[PDB]
Design an enzyme around this catalytic site. Sequence first.
Site, PDB file in Angstrom:
ATOM      1  N   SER A 150     -11.671  10.618  -4.852  1.00 30.27           N
ATOM      2  CA  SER A 150     -11.207  10.323  -3.576  1.00 30.27           C
ATOM      3  C   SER A 150      -9.693  10.213  -3.568  1.00 30.27           C
ATOM      4  O   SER A 150      -8.988  10.143  -4.603  1.00 30.27           O
ATOM      5  CB  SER A 150     -11.856   9.057  -3.115  1.00 30.27           C
ATOM      6  OG  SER A 150     -11.415   8.003  -3.906  1.00 30.27           O
TER       7      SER A 150
ATOM      8  N   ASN B 237      -9.239   5.211   2.501  1.00 32.71           N
ATOM      9  CA  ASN B 237      -9.912   6.020   1.496  1.00 32.71           C
ATOM     10  C   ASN B 237     -10.913   7.004   2.040  1.00 32.71           C
ATOM     11  O   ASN B 237     -11.695   6.685   2.920  1.00 32.71           O
ATOM     12  CB  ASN B 237     -10.573   5.055   0.468  1.00 32.71           C
ATOM     13  CG  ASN B 237     -11.119   5.755  -0.711  1.00 32.71           C
ATOM     14  OD1 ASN B 237     -10.412   6.097  -1.656  1.00 32.71           O
ATOM     15  ND2 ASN B 237     -12.391   6.052  -0.671  1.00 32.71           N
TER      16      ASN B 237
ATOM     17  N   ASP C  40     -12.303   8.508  -8.901  1.00 36.31           N
ATOM     18  CA  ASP C  40     -13.566   9.007  -8.454  1.00 36.31           C
ATOM     19  C   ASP C  40     -13.440  10.266  -7.576  1.00 36.31           C
ATOM     20  O   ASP C  40     -14.454  10.668  -6.954  1.00 36.31           O
ATOM     21  CB  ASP C  40     -14.260   7.902  -7.716  1.00 36.31           C
ATOM     22  CG  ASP C  40     -13.675   7.643  -6.367  1.00 36.31           C
ATOM     23  OD1 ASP C  40     -12.483   8.071  -6.188  1.00 36.31           O
ATOM     24  OD2 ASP C  40     -14.390   7.071  -5.515  1.00 36.31           O
TER      25      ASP C  40
ATOM     26  N   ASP D 252     -15.772  -4.966   8.677  1.00 35.00           N
ATOM     27  CA  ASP D 252     -16.995  -4.427   8.032  1.00 35.00           C
ATOM     28  C   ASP D 252     -17.733  -5.454   7.162  1.00 35.00           C
ATOM     29  O   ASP D 252     -18.896  -5.244   6.817  1.00 35.00           O
ATOM     30  CB  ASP D 252     -16.630  -3.172   7.180  1.00 35.00           C
ATOM     31  CG  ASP D 252     -17.810  -2.197   6.975  1.00 35.00           C
ATOM     32  OD1 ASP D 252     -18.541  -1.941   7.948  1.00 35.00           O
ATOM     33  OD2 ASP D 252     -17.993  -1.697   5.839  1.00 35.00           O
TER      34      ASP D 252
ATOM     35  N   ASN E 219      -7.579   8.956  -6.462  1.00 31.90           N
ATOM     36  CA  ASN E 219      -8.374   8.013  -7.260  1.00 31.90           C
ATOM     37  C   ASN E 219      -9.192   8.742  -8.283  1.00 31.90           C
ATOM     38  O   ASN E 219      -9.472   9.895  -8.174  1.00 31.90           O
ATOM     39  CB  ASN E 219      -9.247   7.184  -6.392  1.00 31.90           C
ATOM     40  CG  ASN E 219      -8.432   6.360  -5.506  1.00 31.90           C
ATOM     41  OD1 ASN E 219      -8.424   6.597  -4.342  1.00 31.90           O
ATOM     42  ND2 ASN E 219      -7.578   5.552  -6.089  1.00 31.90           N
TER      43      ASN E 219
ATOM     44  N   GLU F 266       0.852  -1.232   0.000  1.00 32.54           N
ATOM     45  CA  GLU F 266       0.000   0.000   0.000  1.00 32.54           C
ATOM     46  C   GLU F 266       0.890   1.287   0.000  1.00 32.54           C
ATOM     47  O   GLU F 266       0.551   2.341  -0.531  1.00 32.54           O
ATOM     48  CB  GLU F 266      -0.950   0.005   1.181  1.00 32.54           C
ATOM     49  CG  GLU F 266      -2.037  -1.080   1.180  1.00 32.54           C
ATOM     50  CD  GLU F 266      -3.086  -0.917   0.071  1.00 32.54           C
ATOM     51  OE1 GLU F 266      -3.172   0.225  -0.503  1.00 32.54           O
ATOM     52  OE2 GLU F 266      -3.808  -1.913  -0.236  1.00 32.54           O
TER      53      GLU F 266
ATOM     54  N   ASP G 106      -6.544   8.094  -1.229  1.00 30.01           N
ATOM     55  CA  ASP G 106      -6.074   7.137  -0.267  1.00 30.01           C
ATOM     56  C   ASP G 106      -4.924   7.732   0.551  1.00 30.01           C
ATOM     57  O   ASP G 106      -4.021   8.356  -0.063  1.00 30.01           O
ATOM     58  CB  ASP G 106      -5.550   5.927  -1.062  1.00 30.01           C
ATOM     59  CG  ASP G 106      -6.652   5.152  -1.771  1.00 30.01           C
ATOM     60  OD1 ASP G 106      -7.749   5.061  -1.250  1.00 30.01           O
ATOM     61  OD2 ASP G 106      -6.318   4.554  -2.772  1.00 30.01           O
TER      62      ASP G 106
END
Length: 129
Positions: free
Chosen positions: A50, A59, A48, A101, A46, A35, A52
């Site tokens: 967003s 995110n 979209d 989650d 990203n 990562e 990270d």
Amino acid sequence: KVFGRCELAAAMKRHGLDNYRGYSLGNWVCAAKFESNFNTQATNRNTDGSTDYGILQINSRWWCNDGRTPGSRNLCNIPCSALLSSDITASVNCAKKIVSDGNGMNAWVAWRNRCKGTDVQAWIRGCRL
Ligand code: NA
């Protein structure tokens, strides 16, 4: 801060990640390696809109507030800049919410593609844990 491998393992162990949700320490170390290369200040944008953030590349659409991600949630109740600290506590606490989650460590595409199904014990070999 850029962690050494065993230094980060030790830090993750003291914050309770070894075997958290059944994920051994080598899993977390492996996911941090790919990562971010162990570098807390890491960021990546990203498509979209967003971004990270931090050692675990968490995110902003779901887990942190950066002020520039529309319509996004802040499920960890923290500004995304807190994830860039030399103190990995905040990232660890948020990652515990992510991994619990429902998809486990599959929330980290580098984990799924580079760590899952490998001998991830390698990542903590040699360390004084
Ligand atoms: Na957000």
